[PDB]
Amino acid sequence: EYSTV
Amino acid sequence: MDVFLMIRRHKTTIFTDAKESSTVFELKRIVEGILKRPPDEQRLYKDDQLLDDGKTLGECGFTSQTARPQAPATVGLAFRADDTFEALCIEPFSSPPELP
Amino acid sequence: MYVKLISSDGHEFIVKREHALTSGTIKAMLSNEVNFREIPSHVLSKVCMYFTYKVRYTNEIPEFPIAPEIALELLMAANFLDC
Amino acid sequence: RSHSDFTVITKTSSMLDTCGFYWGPMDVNVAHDKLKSEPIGTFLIRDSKQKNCFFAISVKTARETVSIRIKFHAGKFSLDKELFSCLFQLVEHYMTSPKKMLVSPLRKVRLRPLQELCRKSILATFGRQNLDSIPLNRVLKDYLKSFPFQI
């Protein structure tokens, strides 16, 4: 589970 | 908890630790083994306040929160010169120079 | 038991022998007294605090404070004392 | 390919091993489970099991623990729109900004040597630019340039 900003 | 101290007299500084529940007299016993002076020839000070023998370090204001390993509390030390105890005298450390 | 460390200005610092063995340099030149004719007292006192700081918290560790005015001289001592 | 991009990645990898908070090949689950017990804002750099991703940064935000991938494109490092030449220049940037997404790095050894703590203070007050205006000899000046960051 990865994301950004 | 444990309290970390700096016992200073003239140009001598002793780094040591003790229990917050330990007494000032126990601290004098530590200095006796190091500087070869008996407890009846020693006087320990917090700033200008003379510490009582039967009071614990916590009761004297030395708490683990205010005397950390990286910031040990300063305890003044004076020895007995014949009749009386010499005046408290702690030689200050040097100061760093001004920033370039 | 205890060892005595003397600074350039003649200030005597008495610390536990096990604490002084942290420095590889001090460990190499010790039998009960070591003379540091090139390190001032305000730097050597800060190093002695680091010995207690390093040995106690070697295990969230509180930050070791370093004033900017002593950072240059303290770096020279740390590089020499190997710690 | 790409020319001097090889000279950059090989240089950062040496700095990745120099710093303490690089954990190399690390599972995403253990990275989030390790940081869940750490205070808010504690970040960490580790390898990424993906094929198109060199490194990942795992930070604990106020809401949850997130892992963000790091993109490298034409000699510039970016997080998953600000490009940076060095990876630790990217780390220092997000550490100094008011957003405080990153605050403290979880190092393998939490207690750093006195030389590193002094080095971090030297760079914080003078800067990597003034590193040559310092009255310090070559051995110490080179040590400051070995890892010139406030991190």
Author numbering:
A (entry chain G): 756 to 760
B (entry chain B): 1 to 100
C (entry chain C): 17 to 47, 58 to 85, 89 to 112
D (entry chain A): 59 to 138, 141 to 211
Quote from the publication.
Prolonged signalling, particularly by inflammatory cytokines, is detrimental to both the cell and the organism, and is therefore tightly regulated, in particular, by the SOCS (Suppressors of Cytokine Signalling) family of proteins. We have determined its mode-of-action by solving two X-ray crystal structures of SOCS1 bound to its physiological targets (both the ElonginB/C adapter complex and also the JAK1 kinase domain). SOCS1 is shown to be a direct inhibitor of the catalytic activity of JAK1, JAK2 and TYK2 but not JAK3. Our structure reveals that SOCS1 inhibits these three JAK family members by blocking the substrate binding groove on JAK, acting as a pseudosubstrate.
Successful expression and purification was achieved by deleting the first 52 residues, co-expressing SOCS1 with its native ligands, Elongins B and C and including a phosphotyrosine mimetic during purification. We solved the structure of SOCS1 from Xenopus laevis in complex with Elongins B and C. Although the human form of the complex did not crystallise, the SOCS box from xlSOCS1 is 73% identical and 85% similar to the human domain and contains identical Elongin BC and Cullin5 binding motifs. SOCS1 forms a complex with Elongin BC that is structurally similar to other SOCS/Elongin BC complexes. Comparison of the structure of the SOCS box with the same domain from SOCS2 (which targets Cullin5 with 100-fold higher affinity) shows no large-scale structural differences between the two. Overlay of the Cullin5 binding region from SOCS1 and SOCS2 indicates that the IPLN sequence in SOCS1 occupies roughly the same spatial position as the canonical LPφP motif in SOCS2. The only other residue in SOCS2 that makes contact with Cullin5 is Arg186, two-residues downstream of the LPφP motif. This residue is Val199 in SOCS1 and has too short a sidechain to make contact with Cul5.
